[PDB]
Design a protein around this nucleic acid. Structure first.
Lengths: 119, 176, 52, 106, 187, 73
RNA sequence: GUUUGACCUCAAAUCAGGUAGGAGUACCCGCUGAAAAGCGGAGGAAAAGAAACCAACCGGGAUUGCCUUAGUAACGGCGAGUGAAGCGGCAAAAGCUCAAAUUUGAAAUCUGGUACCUUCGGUGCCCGAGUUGUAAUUUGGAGAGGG
């Protein structure tokens, strides 16, 4: 008796916004019904429906923003990774794997060899 | 190269030309703030042997201190002011009866030249936060007195450390 | 006080340099590092990353 | 006040280290090839000992370079000086025996 | 403002006080026509820009890319020399035929040995006015030094008479007053 | 001993190695020198054209012998 | 030329991109300090660390930690008591980078923007930074030029 998520993935944004308007009107009616009602199960369903509608709308907006910012060598901070303090900072892998050219020539000239003793 | 000329000329401080430049520059810096940004090292050879490179990510501050040490406090001032920067090192340039002047090299770990270029990328490590606050600089290690030699004994902080050696007792599972 | 500067050391002129540093090979021949940059551009054009 | 309750435990952990390091170093020994070196201090001058590293000149007398010898797992000390003949010769024989028993993968 | 106040108060406190004679050799500098002909000389020997360099590189690289390996021939590049350690490096061989020295450097002590050094090495130095004018002839912002060693045969006779001109105009005129303590007169 | 023998075979196993060849421009340069002077080295050492890097007396020999073993006997 | 322009300095930007703060704080490192408290700064460890060392020997060989040295040396109204270190045995082991003479036959170096691409980045182009020196090579154990 409730909405599905995947059904809302197919819809256009105006269909989702009109569905939202419908659910808010349904909520406004169910409040008038619920001020007479001791227990109405339908309002608990429709608030979850409003939540899922907002989920699908926000998700489509965010993925549209990601697609328009896809090519650039930048991003809005909220769209970036969250990870923590200082995993933002202080190194990338490339900035840690980076080595001078002299030690590069040294490792080319004398790498750490593989040997087996007592043979 | 010309750096040997600058060093040997730098060793003769009370010579007439150097005291002339010193006497002009102390008044000139007296016009400015306590702490400010210098465009370039006035003693470039000393900055080289302390580790300066002329590229982006190297900031030179000039700092004024009243007559801990004076040099380490001078490093602590610009460490407090430019927190994003990491303090490389510092050196004396000039002094007055009222103030001594120091010239401090700080390095930004945010600039991609510093984040690459593996001679200097070690300073991007968060263990190098505020080396002057822990006395991890050159003047900090001198005032801590950390070298090798019988002249170097238990001094102040290490004294509490060896007080710690007298304060704690060690027991094994089988008593010896 | 003040007095004019004595030029005792300038007035003798060195007929020779200080250092007996041997002359390098690369000062006489066309520059190698130039040519390495040339071959870099050649490899980029062979891959078509640089248009003539 | 401190009691080494972990004396049993840490050894286990240490052998775990001696296991785990060995896992990465699977053919090679955990330790390098150290010199046999006679001790100072007349109380101990009859005692021979494990030393830190050999020297440049000794490794050259073995017939290889120290920069390569560090890749072979031979500990090298530059700041030591070889001053006794028999120490030098015995450590050269040690280097030769170590060279005899290794097989190196390309 | 403060910075206008200081930059006007600067050069007052200098001239008010006795400058040492190893300074004020500067601003005893080259006159108008001789500096003009010196610039006419050095603009004949401009170094190659990065754009012109990369352009010639692309030309010869497209040549080898066709291959069309045209020949292996180029005499040498001749240009001015402008790196300060490189300028000092060209002395103590000696290789510097002419050196221009800027009067204004804010770390003056970078420069102060160079007149005495070219004096003892016998190099025909001349103190030029303004390191920006040095940087213009060498595609830098400033240069503060300008050494010149290699000259074509078309220009070599002009070089020698310019050297004699400078040694007449600089070494004869200002040599004794170089020894004297400049400034000291109040403002 | 057995697995020692297996690793001794593996380290004793020669890897499939490649001979370090020559580059086409410089072997063509050597080919120009081979036809200009022939085989003699004192003439080609004091050659200005096509020896502008002024190669060492014997480096010339080494590169020509490598080129001959590669091509042209 | 009363013009125009190089610089250099200093401002301004609702310009672009970044970063500092606070909490906690067992362990660590600095500063201050009584009869500890406090302050400042970090990390999973921190610090220290590759001898201007220790020795006096048939010499040893970065640092760290454990056992011993040892309650010894030494200090102390030589009173209260205070209180090491070399060596040895072990755990663990690892070494490296600058700054000095020119690449001068070509600043060869890098940030940033943009266009693409296989995106902890790559390539191209263009601004810049930089000779008041960014690259390669060389840190005494030498090393460099050549042959």
């Amino acid at each position: 008796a409730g909405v599905k998520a995947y059904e809302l993935r197919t819809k256009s944004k105006e269909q989702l916004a009109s569905q939202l308007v419908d659910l808010k009107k349904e909520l406004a009616e169910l409040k008038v019904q619920k001020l007479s009602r001791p227990s109405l199960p339908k309002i608990k369903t429709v608030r979850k429906s409003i939540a899922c509608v907002l989920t699908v709308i926000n998700e489509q907006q965010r993925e549209a923003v990601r697609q328009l910012y896809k090519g650039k060598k930048y991003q809005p901070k909220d769209l970036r990774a969250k990870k923590t303090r200082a995993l933002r900072r202080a190194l990338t892998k490339f900035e840690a794997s980076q080595v001078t050219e002299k030690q590069r020539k040294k490792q080319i000239a004398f790498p750490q060899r593989k040997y087996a003793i007592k043979a | 190269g010309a750096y040997k000329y600058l060093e040997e000329l730098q060793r003769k401080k009370q010579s007439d030309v150097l005291r002339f430049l010193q006497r002009v520059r102390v008044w000139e810096y007296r016009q400015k703030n306590v702490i400010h940004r210098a465009a370039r090292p006035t003693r470039p050879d000393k900055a080289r042997r302390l580790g300066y490179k002329a590229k982006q990510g190297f900031v030179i501050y000039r700092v004024r201190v009243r007559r801990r040490s004076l040099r380490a406090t001078a490093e602590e001032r610009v460490g407090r002011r430019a927190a994003n920067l990491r303090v490389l090192n510092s050196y004396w340039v000039n002094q007055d009866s009222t103030y001594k002047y120091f010239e401090v090299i700080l390095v930004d770990p945010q600039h991609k030249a510093i984040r690459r270029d593996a001679r200097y990328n070690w300073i991007c490590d968060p263990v190098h936060k505020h080396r002057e606050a822990r006395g991890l600089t050159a003047t900090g290690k001198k005032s801590r007195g950390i070298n090798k030699g019988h002249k170097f004994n238990n001094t102040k902080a290490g004294r509490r450390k060896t007080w710690k050696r007298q304060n704690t007792l060690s027991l094994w599972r089988y008593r010896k | 006080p003040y007095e004019p500067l004595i030029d005792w050391f300038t007035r003798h002129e060195e007929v020779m340099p200080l250092t007996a540093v041997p002359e390098p090979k690369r000062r006489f021949v066309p520059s190698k590092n130039e040519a390495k940059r040339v071959m870099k551009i050649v490899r980029a054009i062979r891959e078509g990353r640089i248009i003539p | 006040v401190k009691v080494h309750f972990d004396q049993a435990g840490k050894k286990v952990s240490r052998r775990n280290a001696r296991a785990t390091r060995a896992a990465k170093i699977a053919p090679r020994p955990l330790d390098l090839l150290r010199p046999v070196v006679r001790a100072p201090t007349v109380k101990y001058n009859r005692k021979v000992r494990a030393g830190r590293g050999f020297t440049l000149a000794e490794v050259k007398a073995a017939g290889l370079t120290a920069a390569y010898a560090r890749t072979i797992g031979i500990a090298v000390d530059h700041r030591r000086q070889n001053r006794n003949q028999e120490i030098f010769d015995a450590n050269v024989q040690r280097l030769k025996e170590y060279q005899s028993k290794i097989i190196v993968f390309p | 403002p403060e910075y206008v106040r200081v930059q006007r108060q600067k050069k007052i406190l200098s001239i008010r006080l006795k400058v040492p004679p190893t300074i004020a050799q500067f601003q005893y500098t080259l006159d108008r026509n001789t500096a003009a002909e010196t610039f006419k000389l050095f603009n004949k020997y401009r170094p190659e820009t990065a754009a012109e360099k990369k352009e010639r590189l692309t030309k010869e690289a497209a040549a080898v890319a066709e291959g069309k390996s045209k020949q292996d021939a180029s005499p040498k590049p001749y240009a001015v020399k402008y790196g300060l350690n490189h300028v000092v490096a060209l002395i103590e061989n000696k290789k510097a035929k002419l050196v221009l020295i800027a009067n204004d450097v804010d770390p003056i002590e970078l420069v102060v040995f160079l007149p005495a050094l070219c004096k003892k090495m016998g190099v025909p130095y001349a103190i030029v006015k303004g390191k920006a004018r040095l940087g213009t002839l060498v595609n830098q912002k400033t240069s503060a030094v300008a050494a010149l060693t290699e000259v074509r045969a078309e220009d070599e006779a002009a070089l020698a008479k310019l050297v004699s001109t400078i040694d007449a105009n600089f070494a004869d005129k200002y040599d004794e007053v170089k020894k004297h303590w400049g400034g000291g007169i109040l403002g | 001993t057995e697995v020692v023998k297996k690793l001794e075979e593996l380290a004793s196993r020669p890897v499939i190695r490649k001979e370090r060849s020559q580059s086409e421009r410089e072997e063509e340069w050597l080919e120009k020198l081979y036809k200009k002077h022939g085989d003699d080295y004192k003439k080609m050492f004091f050659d200005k054209k096509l020896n502008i890097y002024q190669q060492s007396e014997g480096d010339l020999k080494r590169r020509l012998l490598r080129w001959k073993k590669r091509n042209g006997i």
